[PDB]
Amino acid sequence: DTFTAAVYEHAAILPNATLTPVSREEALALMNRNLDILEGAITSAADQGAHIIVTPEDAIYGWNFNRDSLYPYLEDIPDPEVNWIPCNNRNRFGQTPVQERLSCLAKNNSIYVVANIGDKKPCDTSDPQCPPDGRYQYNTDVVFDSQGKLVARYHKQNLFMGENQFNVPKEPEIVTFNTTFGSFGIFTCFDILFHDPAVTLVKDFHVDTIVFPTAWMNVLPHLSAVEFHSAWAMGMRVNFLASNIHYPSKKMTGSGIYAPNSSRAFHYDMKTEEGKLLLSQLDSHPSHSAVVNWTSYASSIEALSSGNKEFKGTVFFDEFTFVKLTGVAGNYTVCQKDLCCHLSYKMSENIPNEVYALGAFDGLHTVEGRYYLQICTLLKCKTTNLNTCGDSAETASTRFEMFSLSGTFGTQYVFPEVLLSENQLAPGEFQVSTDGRLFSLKPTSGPVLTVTLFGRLYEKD
Ligand SMILES: *[C@@H]1O[C@H](CO)[C@@H](O[C@@H]2O[C@H](CO)[C@@H](O[C@@H]3O[C@H](CO[C@@H]4O[C@H](CO)[C@@H](O)[C@H](O[C@@H]5O[C@H](CO)[C@@H](O)[C@H](O)[C@@H]5O)[C@@H]4O)[C@@H](O)[C@H](O[C@@H]4O[C@H](CO)[C@@H](O)[C@H](O)[C@@H]4O)[C@@H]3O)[C@H](O)[C@H]2NC(C)=O)[C@H](O)[C@H]1NC(C)=O
Ligand SMILES: *[C@@H]1O[C@H](CO)[C@@H](O[C@@H]2O[C@H](CO)[C@@H](O[C@@H]3O[C@H](CO)[C@@H](O)[C@H](O)[C@@H]3O)[C@H](O)[C@H]2NC(C)=O)[C@H](O)[C@H]1NC(C)=O
Ligand SMILES: C[C@H](Nc1ncc(C(=O)N2CCC3(CCOCC3)C2)cn1)c1cnccn1
Ligand SMILES: *[C@@H]1O[C@H](CO)[C@@H](O)[C@H](O)[C@H]1NC(C)=O
Ligand SMILES: *[C@@H]1O[C@H](CO)[C@@H](O)[C@H](O)[C@H]1NC(C)=O
């Protein structure tokens, strides 16, 4: 059994903003301007045979808000158990025009629709956890099945820096929906960097596929959307539908359809202002059985290089211990604290004025979010100057005939990243071994920007 997956990257119409909160009518008009565009993508996807379509986080109202300015955009989204088709019973829960339209879009096009909107939950001064505002406001994913029925509601657990317009639920919501084309899990944006609910859906609830509305700000060399989201799908052995906001001025671009084996379709564009609809086939029940011990090989072998010239380099405000790669071929080992990284490589030719380095990082990230990292990276240094290794580099000229990366990871959550010039994925030019080695299967189709083993130690957060 297979199915056709669709994702839409959306150039959103943002509200004029801000000062005084708009009226419901002004809020609704903006939301309908965005919905008219999403309607175009949903209908085409459905006409092209897609069983499900994911639309981005904040796609209907954007991201510039405080609690009071956000309020007029919010609807009380009921509990999915309530058994409701808003397209067939429009006023069951009072004034709900957005839910009604999303329900009709899914129903009239006979397709599952995943969208991100805002939930309002009025509360009284009685419960202590109730805000002085008189309500809870949540960043909410809604899922409508092919008949227009609300089948899932997910309130984002992991809020980002300055997302002050929203609340966090007391307990993480582990939201799943079952279909004739697999079991589906859902989470949003920054959730992909945490354990709850992301890891739990995969490891405990055994979902086949994740639907992921995102409004992702790209941070090279490891946290470009297409790169990290496909790495997480590969590391977690799950299908993954990433639907992102298109806003190049904020480095927002990178939607795709990912399988456990490799990427299946992807989109990156920093040049145009246009959205993009992607479609691709996937297995309904892929194999999740291909287990990897990430420290196996690396903890068995001895250092591949001795007494080398090592230097400190900054990668996304994190201080990595690096080792320059000298020669068209080599074997290097570099360590930082409990982590030892090993690389075996051979370039297609040595390109002049292009420096590559092997980096190790074992520590806590703190800038704009706290999370514990263990990273082994083969990266293209931005320039020939070693103090530029770990800086955001978008192009490279060095292809590689072979690579084999590994590390002494103190975690089972390691995401394998392969990123080519210019922010292009490499399907299926690489594989991961049961030993925890990220290695090439052919010479790379294009020049390499990075080959990384991105590990998360959730317990040390
Ligand atoms: C989400 O929805 C899914 C889909 O509906 C639910 O999964 C279904 O659960 C049913 C109940 O447990 C399963 O029914 C039993 O099936 C076996 C036959 O084995 C299957 O053969 C199928 C046809 O070839 C095949 O689709 C199926 O799935 C595959 O399983 C293999 C592993 O073997 C895996 O590799 C694949 O990826 C895929 O999952 C199996 O191979 C029957 O023997 C069994 O017996 C009957 O019991 C009935 C009573 O329940 C009775 O009517 C009858 O007389 C027999 O005694 C059941 O019919 C069904 O296989 C399974 N489908 C899939 C695709 O998983 C899932 O439970 C839902 N989850 C939640 C949380 O709600
Ligand atoms: C993944 O592979 C590694 C390597 O085999 C596994 O880690 C190893 O786990 C064993 C336990 O089975 C550890 O042994 C212990 O050694 C210490 C002394 O050093 C002591 O407490 C005991 O003598 C015990 O035998 C071993 O040290 C450890 N190695 C490392 C580097 O952590 C790992 O658990 C495997 N995981 C799976 C699920 O396959
Ligand atoms: C690389 C990664 N990118 C990232 N992380 C998180 C969010 C996120 O959750 N957003 C939610 C809505 C959003 C609020 C800010 O304005 C825009 C819309 C962005 C977006 N991009 C990252 C991680 N840690 C620090 C910095 N960046
Ligand atoms: C869906 O169809 C119903 C009638 O079939 C119609 O009233 C409604 O406007 C349609 N909605 C959309 C957004 O297609
Ligand atoms: C790297 O290691 C492999 C395996 O030991 C070896 O075949 C290869 O020649 C080495 N290359 C260099 C340049 O050290």
375 Cα–ligand 3 center, Å: 20
Neighbours of 366 (CB within 10 A): 10
Q: What angle do CA 50, 53, 414 make, to 5 degrees?
A: 110
The ligand whose atoms approach the alpha carbon of 2 most closely is 1
| Residue 57: active-site member | yes
Sort strands 182-186 and 209-214 into parallel, antiparallel or unpaired: parallel
Strands in 76-173 per DSSP E? 112-122, 135-144, 150-155
Which residue's CA lies nearest to atom 5 of ligand 5? 331
Technique used by the depositors: X-ray
Tally of CA atoms within 13 A in the half-sphere of 284 that contains its CB: 10
Evaluate: CB of 331 within 6 angstroms of ligand 5: yes
Evaluate: CB of 384 within 6 angstroms of ligand 5: no
C-alpha dihedral, 452 to 453 to 454 to 460, nearest 10°: -150
Tally of CA atoms within 13 A in the half-sphere of 74 that contains its CB: 23
Evaluate: CB of 140 within 6 angstroms of ligand 2: no
Give me the CATH number covering residue 204.
3.60.110.10
* Closest-lying ligand 3 atom to the alpha carbon of residue 190: 9
CA dist., res. 238 & res. 233, Å (int):
5
Which residue's CA lies nearest to atom 2 of ligand 1? 178
CA dist., res. 103 & res. 89, Å (int):
10
Sort strands 430-432 and 438-440 into parallel, antiparallel or unpaired: antiparallel
142 Cα–ligand 1 center, Å: 27
CA dist., res. 420 & res. 398, Å (int):
10
Whole-angstrom CA distances from 398 to 74, 297, 314, 342, 395 are 50, 27, 22, 20, 10
Resolution (A): 2.2
Which of 297, 342, 344, 404 gets mutated to test ligand 5 (max ligand atoms within 8 A of its CB)? 344
Out of 100, 107, 149, 189, the active site residue is 189
Q: DSSP letter for 21, please.
A: P
Out of 57, 75, 100, 417, the active site residue is 57
* Closest-lying ligand 3 atom to the alpha carbon of residue 250: 17
149 Cα–ligand 4 center, Å: 14
Helix (H, G, I), strand (E, B) or coil at 388: helix
Closest CA to 63 of 244, 289, 232: 244
Evaluate: CB of 392 within 6 angstroms of ligand 5: no
Helix (H, G, I), strand (E, B) or coil at 252: strand
The ligand whose atoms approach the alpha carbon of 101 most closely is 4
| Residue 460: active-site member | no
The ligand whose atoms approach the alpha carbon of 436 most closely is 2
Q: Residue 347: beta bridge partners? A: 400
CA dist., res. 191 & res. 181, Å (int):
24
336 Cα–ligand 1 center, Å: 47
The ligand whose atoms approach the alpha carbon of 291 most closely is 2
238 Cα–ligand 4 center, Å: 34
Residues near ligand 1 (Cβ within 6 A): 178, 183, 285
117 Cα–ligand 1 center, Å: 34
CA dist., res. 343 & res. 316, Å (int):
22
End-to-end CA distance of the chain: 39
Residue 237 zone, left/alpha/beta (φ > 0; ψ -120 to 50; rest): left
Structure-block tokens of residue 168 = 């966090």
Closest CA to 326 of 308, 342, 339, 302: 308
| Percentages (nearest 5) of helix, strand, coil residues in the chain | 20, 35, 45
Closest CA to 275 of 45, 103, 3, 97: 45
146 Cα–ligand 4 center, Å: 14
* Closest-lying ligand 5 atom to the alpha carbon of residue 329: 13
Which of 183, 205, 207, 208 gets mutated to test ligand 1 (max ligand atoms within 8 A of its CB)? 183
Structure-block tokens of residue 147 = 């008949």
| Residue 120: active-site member | no
